[PDB]
């Protein structure tokens, strides 16, 4: 019922009109413009992410690089910067009166740059895992048959990289489809920006619902295409032994430079810009910073607790007792995560108005929606912790003299609670920096840090919005670093 009921009425609400009204809504020239803009932005972001991620993964996997883990952490760090924070930094640091002597780029190019810089680490991680998951004996056999290393990469390594390319491309395309802060702050007209404009500005709820239906149709088509391609080239480790890395020589200083341009552009420069802007922070706005931080905490805590409380049973049933209910629940959680947040919030609004009017405009509805949206984010680490301890380990503990309760509490619990803590932290930081769902579902007069940043940037008060973005980026980066260190420990 997490998504089965909400998005059901999203199509029901849209299909409530005269049959000619639906034809008129479908026959509008703006739909083609929105589709073209969305597809072009997705393609450009995919290209930029590939160009940044493939060489970086190669350098940090198949090259005698000094400190591969440090460079991997530095390249994964841009995941902590939200899209609206990057758009705000780009707007404030360019144009007239900006930090840099550059004009503000077009809506397409700024959005493309920010979205690529914040979405490439998914492809980077997927490609790094794919590179690490190959058997060096396969490339050695290809090379003994008469194939130089470049043709070996073309005909051996790349087909094994392809599934990682599909996974990273799906993640990046979903992020571009569901992104709202970057395109709205830079005034780029995608489906999400159009939905927000129709719901809020134009007050055209029916056309907003139709645009949301178009967006879910695109999301479903992308998911189906990814599934079909994955089943086409499933391909079905080889001990993952170490092979002599390719020597650099005089290219060592250059490659490091290429490994520094992303981190400098997405992490260091935003921090410097925010610290330069926050110097002229009016003391009158100090009272609204504490209120925003308190509101963000008050929303993020129950969301994290509920996300963990729903992820633990789902993961336990998926691992210990795999049944059709397990796959249905996991697919429902994935759909809740993958549906664009603005259309998700609109579906929740429509469902609450239709069925449970007492929940509309309350904190309970927002907390429940955010808990369902971050179900996969918490479910990840719990899945890993439960996969690291099979029930055969509980059987082994039972043969040694342990009752089933003690076998659980001495074998499964020590990893289960750590996975739960990691998932709770992930959901906490996710709900701390959520713009669309919080913007569209929070009660009137309730504002968190992300909404304050969005509202201040919409009226062009950069210095006022600087401390809020500083808090968001600082907590996000600290949590990402701590979780990465803990994962490396485990």
């Amino acid at each position: 019922a997490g998504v089965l009921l909400p998005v059901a009425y999203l199509g029901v609400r849209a299909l409530e009109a005269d049959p000619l009204v639906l034809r008129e809504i479908l026959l509008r020239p703006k739909n083609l413009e929105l589709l073209r803009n969305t597809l072009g932005l997705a393609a450009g972001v995919l290209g930029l992410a590939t160009l940044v991620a493939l060489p970086a993964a190669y350098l940090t996997t198949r090259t005698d690089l000094r400190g591969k883990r440090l460079w991997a952490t530095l390249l994964t760090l841009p995941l902590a910067v939200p899209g609206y924070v990057g758009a705000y930094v780009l707007l404030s640091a360019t144009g007239p009166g900006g930090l840099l002597p550059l004009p503000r780029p077009e809506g397409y190019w700024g959005a493309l740059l920010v979205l690529g810089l914040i979405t490439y680490p998914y492809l980077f991680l997927a490609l790094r895992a794919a590179f690490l998951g190959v058997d060096p004996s396969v490339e050695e056999a290809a090379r003994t048959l008469g194939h130089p290393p470049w043709r070996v990469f073309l005909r051996v390594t790349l087909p094994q990289l392809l599934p990682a390319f599909l996974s990273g491309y799906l993640v990046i395309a979903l992020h571009v489809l569901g992104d709202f802060g970057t395109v709205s702050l830079l005034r780029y007209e995608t489906f999400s920006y159009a939905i927000y404009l129709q719901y809020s500005a134009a007050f055209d709820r029916v056309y907003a619902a139709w645009l949301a239906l178009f967006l879910l149709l695109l999301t479903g088509s992308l998911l189906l295409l990814e599934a079909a391609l994955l089943r086409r080239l499933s391909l079905g480790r080889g001990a993952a032994r170490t092979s002599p890395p390719a020597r650099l020589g005089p290219l060592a200083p250059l490659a490091h430079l290429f490994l520094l341009l992303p981190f400098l552009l997405a992490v260091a420069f935003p921090l410097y810009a925010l610290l330069h802007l926050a110097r002229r922070f009016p003391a009158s706005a100090t009272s609204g910073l504490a209120e925003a931080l308190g509101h963000a905490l008050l929303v993020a805590l129950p969301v994290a607790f509920l996300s963990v409380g729903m992820a633990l049973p789902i993961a336990y049933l998926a691992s210990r007792y795999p049944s059709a209910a397990s796959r249905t629940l996991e697919r429902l959680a994935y759909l809740a995560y993958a549906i664009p947040p603005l259309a998700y919030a609109l579906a929740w609004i429509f469902f609450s108005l239709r069925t449970l009017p007492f929940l509309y405009g309350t904190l309970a509805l927002l907390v429940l929606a955010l808990a369902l949206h971050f179900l996969t984010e918490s479910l990840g680490p719990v899945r890993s912790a439960l996969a690291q301890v099979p029930p055969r380990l509980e059987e082994a503990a039972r043969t040694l003299g342990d009752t089933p309760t003690r076998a659980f509490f001495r074998v499964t619990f020590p990893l289960l609670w750590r996975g739960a803590a990691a998932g709770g932290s992930l959901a906490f930081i996710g709900a701390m920096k959520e713009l669309p769902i919080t913007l569209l579902l929070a009660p009137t007069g309730f504002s968190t840090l992300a909404t304050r940043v969005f509202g201040y940037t919409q009226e062009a008060m950069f210095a006022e919005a600087a401390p809020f973005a500083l808090l968001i980026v600082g907590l996000s980066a600290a949590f990402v670093g701590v979780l990465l260190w803990n994962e490396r420990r485990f």
Partner: protein, 340 residues
């Protein structure tokens, strides 16, 4: 090693819903005795180990340990050690906490250290299973199983995951540890050398029913089915007819084990045949000649037999015979009439 059965199964039966994996297993084990279970990888040996360990509930039959019924006890109340194929090592514990898991004296660590020293691991006693090799994980699992001091240890294909070279030494070390400690073992294996050397006795299962149990020499000399005959060692399966104390086969007149009449199948080991210069009797041509050090293993294609028929012959190192030579076959040993 005594005259009283340590472990004794009585009519063990087990259905996986509808498929019966065990069909009346009867088996007796004795103190200090290593018994290896053999079969066509589908006879339900792992199921037998799980039923003995308490991890599965048989649909019938009784289980006795030290003269007392334990078939209704949970796995933790029995006191039977278990070693798994993957060693089932707990990943959150160093390889001393694993060994101390079984020990109930508030996790005695001195005894865990002694158990680790028995399997020869003290320098790596503070390494988690993620940073341990296959043989090291095997030794940790064995020490964990034997630390609570059980009188019976079940071993589900222990060394099958090790390297080819390490198995021969790990097997001997585990055997000497088991024999010096004084614990009986029930082993499930798919190996010939392990069954011949490691085990003290053999038990063969057809379709979840024990059909032949005995010393490896007794099973080798007197097999019952062709699978057993080939498992213990290479052999010659000959259709034939038995009319009395002997039998008539394609190689001539072959002595029988005790007696059988009618059409039958015969197992004749290579060491039961000799090569002679071409004379009377069955004739053939040498197709191959294997050099094995202390002995030679010739292969001979027969002539008078209308279908193609090739027999293995064991010969001494001083045989003056070469591939492609004509030979005559002499039967010196006794064949075994297989039931089927």
């Amino acid at each position: 090693m005594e005259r009283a059965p340590l472990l004794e199964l009585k009519g063990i039966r087990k259905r996986f819903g509808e498929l019966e994996v065990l069909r009346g297993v009867d088996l007796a084990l004795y103190p200090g005795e290593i018994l290896a279970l053999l079969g066509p990888s589908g006879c339900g040996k792992t199921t037998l180990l799980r039923v003995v360990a308490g991890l599965e509930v048989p649909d019938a039959g009784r289980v006795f340990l030290e003269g007392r019924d334990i078939t209704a006890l949970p796995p933790e109340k029995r006191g039977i050690g278990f070693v798994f194929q993957d060693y089932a090592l707990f990943p959150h514990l160093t390889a001393l906490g694993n060994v101390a898991f079984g020990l109930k004296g508030k996790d005695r660590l001195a005894r865990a250290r002694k158990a680790l020293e028995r399997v020869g691991m003290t320098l790596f006693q503070d390494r988690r299973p993620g940073e341990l090799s296959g043989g090291q994980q095997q030794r940790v699992a064995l020490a964990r199983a034997l630390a609570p001091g059980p009188k019976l240890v079940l071993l589900d294909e222990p060394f099958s995951s090790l390297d080819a070279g390490l198995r021969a030494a790990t097997r001997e070390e585990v055997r000497k540890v088991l024999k010096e400690t004084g614990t009986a073992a029930l082993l499930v294996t798919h190996d010939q050398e392990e069954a011949l050397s490691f085990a003290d006795r053999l038990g063969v299962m057809r379709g979840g029913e024990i059909l032949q149990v005995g010393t490896p020499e007794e099973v080798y000399l007197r097999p019952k089915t062709p699978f057993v005959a080939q498992f213990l060692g290479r052999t010659n399966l000959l259709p034939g007819e038995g009319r009395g104390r002997y039998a008539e086969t394609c190689l001539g007149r072959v002595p029988l084990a005790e007696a059988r009449e009618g059409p039958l199948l015969l197992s004749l080991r290579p060491e039961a045949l000799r090569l002679t210069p071409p004379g009377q009797g069955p004739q053939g041509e040498v197709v191959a000649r294997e050099f094995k050090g202390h002995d030679l293993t010739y292969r001979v294609r027969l002539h008078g037999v209308q279908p193609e028929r090739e027999v293995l012959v064991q010969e001494g190192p001083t045989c003056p015979f070469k591939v492609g030579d004509r030979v005559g076959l002499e039967v010196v040993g006794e064949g075994v009439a297989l039931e089927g």
